[PDB]
Structure formats: C-alpha cells, structure tokens
Write an enzyme that holds these catalytic residues in place. Structure first.
Site, PDB file in Angstrom:
ATOM      1  N   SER A 204       0.825  -1.402  -0.036  1.00  0.00           N
ATOM      2  CA  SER A 204       0.125   0.115   0.040  1.00  0.00           C
ATOM      3  C   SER A 204       1.047   1.288   0.061  1.00  0.00           C
ATOM      4  O   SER A 204       2.166   1.051   0.106  1.00  0.00           O
ATOM      5  CB  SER A 204      -1.053   0.124   1.253  1.00  0.00           C
ATOM      6  OG  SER A 204      -2.076   0.848   1.042  1.00  0.00           O
ATOM      7  N   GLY A 211      -2.741   4.668   9.444  1.00  0.00           N
ATOM      8  CA  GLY A 211      -4.239   3.945   9.215  1.00  0.00           C
ATOM      9  C   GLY A 211      -4.259   2.402   9.341  1.00  0.00           C
ATOM     10  O   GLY A 211      -4.831   1.722  10.383  1.00  0.00           O
ATOM     11  N   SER A 244       2.179  -7.331  -5.210  1.00  0.00           N
ATOM     12  CA  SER A 244       1.721  -6.246  -3.917  1.00  0.00           C
ATOM     13  C   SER A 244       2.691  -5.283  -4.145  1.00  0.00           C
ATOM     14  O   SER A 244       2.378  -4.145  -3.613  1.00  0.00           O
ATOM     15  CB  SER A 244       1.964  -7.278  -2.670  1.00  0.00           C
ATOM     16  OG  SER A 244       0.865  -8.041  -2.472  1.00  0.00           O
ATOM     17  N   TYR A 247       1.526  -1.950  -5.729  1.00  0.00           N
ATOM     18  CA  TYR A 247       0.361  -0.989  -5.024  1.00  0.00           C
ATOM     19  C   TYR A 247       1.225   0.121  -3.967  1.00  0.00           C
ATOM     20  O   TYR A 247       0.559   0.746  -3.371  1.00  0.00           O
ATOM     21  CB  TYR A 247      -0.561  -1.893  -4.344  1.00  0.00           C
ATOM     22  CG  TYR A 247      -1.532  -2.750  -5.097  1.00  0.00           C
ATOM     23  CD1 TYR A 247      -2.922  -2.244  -5.296  1.00  0.00           C
ATOM     24  CD2 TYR A 247      -1.240  -3.948  -5.607  1.00  0.00           C
ATOM     25  CE1 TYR A 247      -3.841  -2.493  -6.290  1.00  0.00           C
ATOM     26  CE2 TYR A 247      -2.229  -4.526  -6.680  1.00  0.00           C
ATOM     27  CZ  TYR A 247      -3.484  -3.725  -6.852  1.00  0.00           C
ATOM     28  OH  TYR A 247      -4.307  -4.411  -7.819  1.00  0.00           O
ATOM     29  N   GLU A 328      -4.726 -14.307  -6.333  1.00  0.00           N
ATOM     30  CA  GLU A 328      -5.122 -12.988  -5.808  1.00  0.00           C
ATOM     31  C   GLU A 328      -5.931 -13.871  -4.625  1.00  0.00           C
ATOM     32  O   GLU A 328      -6.525 -15.035  -4.639  1.00  0.00           O
ATOM     33  CB  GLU A 328      -6.040 -12.367  -6.375  1.00  0.00           C
ATOM     34  CG  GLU A 328      -5.940 -10.680  -6.171  1.00  0.00           C
ATOM     35  CD  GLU A 328      -6.474 -10.064  -7.370  1.00  0.00           C
ATOM     36  OE1 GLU A 328      -7.625  -9.326  -7.362  1.00  0.00           O
ATOM     37  OE2 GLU A 328      -5.809  -9.799  -8.502  1.00  0.00           O
TER      38      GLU A 328
END
Ligand SMILES: C[C@@H]1Oc2ccc(CN3CC=C(c4ccc(Cl)cc4)CC3)cc2NC1=O
Length: 351
Positions: A204, A211, A244, A247, A328
């Site tokens: 991310s 968060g 991943s 991202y 996934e």
C-alpha cells in the site's frame, strides 16, 4: 525533549508514515483541490456521501444516457472538490471511472485516520514527537535481526516471487519489522487453527500505513460500490511480492516503499477466474482465490511458526482462460487477518 530510545529504523519508520507533506502529495495525485478540500477538512461523512454518489453512478452505468450520467458525475465532484479551474470536469461514465474513484476514496479513509491521530491527542514539548506518534499506533514494532531464520525466510520470499512481467524494477529489503497490533491476536482466535493459513503480501502507499497500523486492514464501508472492486468488498492479498509491491506506487521521485506480510486464514477457498462483485461468500466458503496463470511452485512451500509460506519460484498453474496473471486472495471478515511483518523496501528502477 527526551530524544527517544526507539531503534533508528523504527524512528525512521514513524517519520515516514506521519509525514504531512506526503499526505498532501497523495491528495494532489488524485487531483483533489487542496484549496477547497484541505487535509484538515477531510471527514469520514463526506467520504461516505461520496461513495454513495459513486454507487448511484455504478447503477446508471449497469443500465445504460450521457444526459443523466452528467448530473451524477457532477454530484460526485460537488462532494469531493477536484482541481479543474473554470472547467467542466471529465465525465464519470464507465466502470474504470468507478474503480478509480472508489480506490481513491479508500485511500482517503486511511489518510483521514493518520491526520486525525496527528491532530487529536496531547501536546507535550518535553517528549520526542517520534515517541508520541509511535504510541498513537497501538502496535508493538520490533526490528527483526538480519541474521535470524525468519529474516532468511522472508528475504527468500522476496527473492523468489518477483514476476518477470514486473521487471522494470527490482527490490532490496532495507528493514524487516515484526509487528503486533493491540487486540488483533484476540480478534483472530476463532481462525487461528483453520486449515489453509498462509503468509501473504499486502502493499500500500506509505501514506496508508498509520491507518493500517492503528486500525488493521479494513473492508470498504457499506456505501462503497461493490462494483468498484474485482472481487467486491474484502481485503486483498498476493503470493508474488512484485504484485503487491506495485501497490506501493513508488517512483524515481520516491523509491522507498512499505509492504506487509499477514497470516491470512483462507480455509475453503472459492476459486474464481473472472470478476465477481460480491459482498458475502456462498455458504461453506471462507475466502476467494482469484486463479492466476502463474503460481509460486507448490512443492517449494515452507512453514514458518506453523503457517504456509508460498516462496517457490513462479511456475504455470495449469489454469487456462483466466483474467489473472497471478493469484489473488480475498477475505470478507477483518477478523481473518493477523498482521505479522512490515518490510521497508528500496525500489531500483531499471528505466
Ligand atoms: C494484492 C493487494 O491488492 C490491493 C488492492 C487495493 C489496495 C488499496 N487499498 C487502499 C485502501 C484500502 C482501504 C482503506 C480504508 C478502508 Cl476503511 C478500507 C479499505 C484497502 C485497499 C492495496 C492492495 N494491495 C495488495 O497488495
């Protein structure tokens, strides 16, 4: 102030994720007008309102006019001011429009948490703000020793699961952290012995991680359009580090990223080859597996503290006509994830 006793890598980590300028930079990337919608004005209820309009738009897309699509498009831009001047913004008239804006709103939910942690709480000048902000995360973060077995395993996972079609960059592990969010092991208890527990990647952007550490990985709220996500509203994982790593959204302008390893309780998988925008699983299933054309070699599986680590090199799955190059995995209950590690990675762009 008292200068802080945390290891240097943890201190640099805290600095990375509470950086306010990086938050603003993510926002201008999404084309948000910071004049009309600044960081300090971001609110959950406005984000939710905006998801609802986005749902209205998904409706009108599924059922085919450019007339009516305009009104709805405009309503969305009313709730999330964009940067278009004396304008006419672009029309939101397709499914890519809906995917892209839903993903943006997901991100704003993480950015609002980080900023609200930064501005709630207390102000004490005799305390290192590194220590103050660390505490806000309610997560224990340790440096994993370069020489341990767990570091070897993790580094081999990184090394073997980089996809050939993602070779415009490669990856170096800078630090490996062992992380433990308060209460999360407790949440996980009903799943902690389910079959098919697996250690999987979740990357991310660095402005999501305050968060994620404070709230865990989360599912998009009820207002979010289920259509905005390939396999609907769950928490997504990969078994190829590069899938991943994409991202992270790093670049030559910022080549340091963060990626998680979580224990994910998969149980009986519902195996799918193409988009299916669901919010609940059929009875008997615990997860969805999007079937990739390529998989880490099953026979190279290793166990780490009892959990499967799929660190074999990529080979053919045998799966024929699939929408997905690589696997996934999606779960639809937040309680099915126990976060284990956080890696800090250097991206070396070969372009
Ligand atoms: C393989 C996996 O795929 C991904 C898909 C989407 C993201 C982006 N995330 C951005 C925001 C999220 C979010 C934030 C707050 C709430 Cl309340 C709900 C959802 C979760 C999704 C990342 C990944 N990364 C992957 O590796």
């Amino acid at each position: 102030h008292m200068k802080s006793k945390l290891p240097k890598p943890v201190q640099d980590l805290i600095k990375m994720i509470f950086d306010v300028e990086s938050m603003k930079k993510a926002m201008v990337e999404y084309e948000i007008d910071l004049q009309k919608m600044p960081l300090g004005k971001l609110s959950k209820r406005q984000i939710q309102a905006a998801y609802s309009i986005l749902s209205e738009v998904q409706q009108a897309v599924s059922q085919g006019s450019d007339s009516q699509i305009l009104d709805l498009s405009n309503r969305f831009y009313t709730l999330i001011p964009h940067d278009f001047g004396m304008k006419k913004p672009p029309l939101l008239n397709n499914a890519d429009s809906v995917q892209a804006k839903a993903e943006m709103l997901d991100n704003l939910l993480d950015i609002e948490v980080a900023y609200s942690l930064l501005r709630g709480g207390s102000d004490d000048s005799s305390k290192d703000p590194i220590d103050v902000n660390y505490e806000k995360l309610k997560t224990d973060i340790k440096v994993v020793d370069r020489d341990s077995e767990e570091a070897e395993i993790i580094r081999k996972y990184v090394k073997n699961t980089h996809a050939t079609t993602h070779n415009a960059y490669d990856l170096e592990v800078i630090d490996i952290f062992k992380i433990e969010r308060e209460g999360e092991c407790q949440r996980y208890k009903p799943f902690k012995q389910l079959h098919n527990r697996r250690l999987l990647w979740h990357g991310s952007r660095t402005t999501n991680f305050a968060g994620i550490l404070s709230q865990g990985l989360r599912i998009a709220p009820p207002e979010a359009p289920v259509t905005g996500y390939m396999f609907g509203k769950g928490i997504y994982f990969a078994d190829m580090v590069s899938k991943s790593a994409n991202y992270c959204h790093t670049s030559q302008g910022d080549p340091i990223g963060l990626i998680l390893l979580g224990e994910v309780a998969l149980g009986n998988m519902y195996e799918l080859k193409h988009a299916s925008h669901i919010s609940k699983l059929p009875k008997g299933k615990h997860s969805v597996k999007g079937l990739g054309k390529t998989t880490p070699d099953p026979s190279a599986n290793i166990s780490l503290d009892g959990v499967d680590v799929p660190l074999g090199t990529g080979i053919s799955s045998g799966v024929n006509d699939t929408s997905l190059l690589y696997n996934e995995y999606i779960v639809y209950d937040i309680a099915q994830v126990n976060l284990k590690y956080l890696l800090k990675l250097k991206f070396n762009f070969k372009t």
